Amino acid sequence: HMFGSLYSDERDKPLLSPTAQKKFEEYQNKLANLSKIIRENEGNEVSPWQEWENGLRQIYKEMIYDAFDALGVEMPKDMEVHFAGSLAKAQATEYSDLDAFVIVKNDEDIKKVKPVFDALNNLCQRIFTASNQIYPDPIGINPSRLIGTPDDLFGMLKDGMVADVEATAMSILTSKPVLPRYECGEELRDKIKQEPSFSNMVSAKKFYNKAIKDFTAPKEGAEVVSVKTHIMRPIDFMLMGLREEFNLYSEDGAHLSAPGTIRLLREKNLLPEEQIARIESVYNQAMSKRFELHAEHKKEHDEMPYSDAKAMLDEVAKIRELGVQRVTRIENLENAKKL
Amino acid sequence: SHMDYLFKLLLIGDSGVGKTCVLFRFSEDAFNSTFISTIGIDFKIRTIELDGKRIKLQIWDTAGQERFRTITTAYYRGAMGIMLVYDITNEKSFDNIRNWIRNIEEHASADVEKMILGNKCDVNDKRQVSKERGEKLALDYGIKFMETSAKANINVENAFFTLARDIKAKMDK
Ligand SMILES: Nc1nc2c(ncn2[C@@H]2O[C@H](COP(=O)(O)OP(=O)(O)NP(=O)(O)O)[C@@H](O)[C@H]2O)c(=O)[nH]1
Ligand SMILES: OC[C@H]1O[C@H](O)[C@H](O)[C@@H](O)[C@@H]1O
Ligand SMILES: OC[C@H]1O[C@H](O)[C@H](O)[C@@H](O)[C@@H]1O
Ligand SMILES: OC[C@H]1O[C@H](O)[C@H](O)[C@@H](O)[C@@H]1O
Ligand SMILES: [Mg+2]
């Protein structure tokens, strides 16, 4: 067959044209340079994972502008692109997936814009096949699957039109704007929080209980544990719980990172310092470990020896005890016993 | 959480002068030593108090890269305050301040507050632009001037509060 354009499907066009290939390599070099910049400046007051999210957001934005230019499509002014997952929280590693979705103001923008995001998914997939990075999940959060008006996307959740409503709802709620455009995102999040049938799946109690009951401690005698399942997930849900309880929000998504939440908990003295410091300490230890593990294996490697995880697991257990007290105090607050 | 005013601020200047680091210092009280060039336009939110009034600062951080200048220019109209940043170690970046000023005059609102920041004032051993030349160019355009350091945390807070004060004084009358 024939050479592929930069936005060709690699299954149909394994070989890029000489022009497309030079541009593909430019993107690969940007990702490689970003990893190199992180290593060289070890001990910077900006964490490796905060630096990665910053670098990757600039790279992805450049891919978006390049793609609109290449396909001869003008970028609508009222179109929003949002990061979801670890990237939205600025705790994605180099081998994390690239979860993004698109909110448009008008339904007719979709026909104009969806081809550009199909093109971008092809490029991202080709990069994934080459360096095992920026995976666009075809059954998850990608701008080709999740594109529409706030009404459309809320409709997907309210009706059946997506498998795992709860996980898509979590993704949309913990999303961060990539462009300086956030109002449609706000409208979408307010519709999800409005929906009576979503009432208790979006509550602080629910998020605290996921940290306590879902993402539970490793079994006794375990030799192996997951820095994701047993440490980073419980922390994530504890922080979602606190953000919901205290209405913590920034239009720029600054609240979604652990340090962002911790900054706000400290500013407003919303939690005792001892407890904030524990969450902060285990977050930094776990993300240092998780960032190292992925870079070393060049893939999502979350398993580590129980013995290496022991200090973090014990702090995570204290954080769960805290979480149980918050759920009780929330139930007790809604009851309001007098005398 | 209460808001009395929303001030729309714009950072403009050559790629590499430290617009992103000036805002990073203001918004997160940290310094990033690495150079990750801004693509299109970024924004940070920070609420401040002036005269017992809550002022939400919506701060647009523009690409200095020439490529994004059509996108960048479109924001001039909406800006209530504009920071013009040059780098005291880069003569070329100071020389372009007159061009940046001409572009504000052409595309910005008639009564937009302006401030010139001579950034990287911690790097005295590589200085190419004397402080007085900065003050002199600023005085000639009747625009307020400060030397700043995102790294050494010098005049970053003062710059943003002084620009916000000038905006507030203008619209209070
Ligand atoms: N010594 C010193 N270096 C600084 C200072 N401010 C920024 N820098 C450095 O200058 C480089 C560029 O800073 P950056 O904020 O990215 O510049 P920018 O104007 O946003 N660039 P662009 O327009 O391309 O987005 C980085 O290496 C940064 O660490 C400062 O006050 N002092
Ligand atoms: O880092 C991504 C995180 O986002 C949300 O909290 C999700 O519920 C979960 O997938 C994860 O904890
Ligand atoms: O009210 C604050 C909360 O509102 C929404 O749930 C947002 O998705 C969440 O990030 C934020 O912390
Ligand atoms: O604002 C006072 C400043 O004056 C000069 O710019 C110096 O280089 C700087 O170090 C000092 O702090
Ligand atoms: Mg920048």
Residue numbers in the entry:
A (entry chain B): 14 to 352
B (entry chain A): 3 to 175
What are the paper's exact sentences on this?
In particular, one intensely studied protein, Legionella effector DrrA (Defect in Rab1 recruitment A, also referred to as SidM, substrate of Icm/Dot), is secreted early during infection, and it manipulates the vesicular trafficking regulator Rab1 (Ras-related protein Rab-1). DrrA consists of three functional domains. The N-terminal domain possesses AMPylation activity (also referred to as adenylylation). AMPylation is a post-translational modification (PTM) in which an adenosine triphosphate (ATP) is utilised in order to transfer adenosine monophosphate (AMP) to hydroxyl-bearing amino acid side chains.
Therefore, we also generated the TReND-1-linked complex with the GTPase domain of the close Rab1b-homologue Rab8a (amino acids 6−176; Rab8a6-176). In order to obtain insight into the molecular basis of DrrA substrate recognition, we determined the crystal structure of the DrrA16-352:TReND-1:Rab8a6-176 complex bound to GppNHp at 2.1 Å resolution (DrrA16-352:TReND-1:Rab8a6-176 will be referred to as DrrA:Rab8a hereafter for clarity). The complex binding mode observed in the crystal structure was unexpected since the Rab molecule does not interact with the catalytic centre of DrrA16-352 constituted by the catalytically important residues D110DrrA and D112DrrA13. Instead, Rab8a:GppNHp binds to a surface patch opposite the catalytic centre that we refer to as the non-conventional (NC) Rab binding site (RBS), hereafter referred to as NC-RBS. In the DrrA:Rab8a complex structure, switch I (E30Rab8a, F33Rab8a and N34Rab8a), the interswitch region (D44Rab8a and K58Rab8a), and switch II (Q60Rab8a and R69Rab8a) of Rab8a mainly interact with the N-terminal half of the ATPase domain of DrrA opposite the catalytic motif, centred at amino acids R70DrrA, Q71DrrA and K74DrrA. Based on the structures of other ATases belonging to the DNA polymerase β-like enzyme family, the catalytic motif of DrrA is expected to be G98-S99-L100-X11-D110-X-D112DrrA, with D110DrrA and D112DrrA involved in coordinating the essential magnesium ion. In contrast to the previous DrrA8-218 fragment structure, the position of D110DrrA and D112DrrA is well defined and the residues appear to be capable of Mg2+ coordination. The covalently bound TReND-1 is well defined in the electron density in the complex crystal structure. The structure of free Rab8a:GppNHp superimposes very well with Rab8a in the NC-RBS-complex, with an RMSD of 0.38 Å, indicating that binding of Rab8a to DrrA does not result in global structural changes in Rab8a. Indeed, upon Rab binding, helix α3 may be pulled into the protein core, and D110DrrA (β2), D112DrrA (β2) and D150DrrA (α4−α5 loop) move together so that the active Mg2+ coordinating function of these amino acid residues can be fulfilled.
